[PDB]
């Protein structure tokens, strides 16, 4: 046979070596990142990300730098689909919540609408 039947939910939290504080009290956020409205490019909105809740960042007493105690504060993962991301979060015992992908709705663009006879959609200048 050399193949066994495991009917259990895939949970590898004992194997990853992560402490229990950063497993059971963290909230993953599974999302497609929003487009930077400073720019018209949409290439950064293609993949699913997993980040975590931002914990405390305090001031360094010596230099004023941003000190942290959160190890997972820089941890951003990248997934092809939402379901891969959810499977990875459930496999590692992370509590997650999922925003659906926001695509821009299709627009009806008409350059002739800018010069209409009887509609309000005339441009006053060009």
């Amino acid at each position: 046979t050399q193949l066994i039947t495991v009917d259990e939910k895939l949970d590898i939290t004992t194997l990853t070596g992560v402490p229990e504080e950063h497993i059971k009290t963290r909230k993953a956020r599974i999302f497609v990142p929003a487009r930077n409205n400073m720019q018209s490019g949409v290439n950064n909105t293609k993949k699913w990300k997993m980040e975590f809740d931002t914990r405390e960042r305090w001031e360094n007493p010596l230099m004023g730098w941003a000190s942290t105690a959160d190890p997972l504060s820089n941890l951003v993962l990248t997934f092809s689909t939402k379901e891969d991301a959810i499977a990875f979060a459930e496999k590692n015992g992370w509590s997650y919540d999922v925003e659906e992908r926001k695509v821009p709705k299709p627009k009806s663009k008409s350059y002739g609408a800018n010069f209409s006879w009887n509609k309000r959609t005339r441009v006053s200048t060009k």
Binding site: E59, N60, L62, M63, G64
Partner: protein, 48 residues
């Protein structure tokens, strides 16, 4: 620098200081920025 002198600037140190580490003139780091969050100062008058 006796032959080819360094180009004079008004901000260059005229008095070169050596390594002052371990002396009272040593460098102590500090944050050069100001306070970020301004706190609410409660009024010094009573509330009755």
């Amino acid at each position: 620098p006796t032959v080819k002198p360094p180009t004079a600037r008004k901000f260059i140190w005229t008095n070169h200081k050596f390594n002052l580490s371990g002396t009272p003139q040593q460098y102590v780091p500090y944050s050069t920025t100001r306070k970020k969050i301004q706190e609410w100062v409660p009024p010094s008058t009573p509330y009755k």
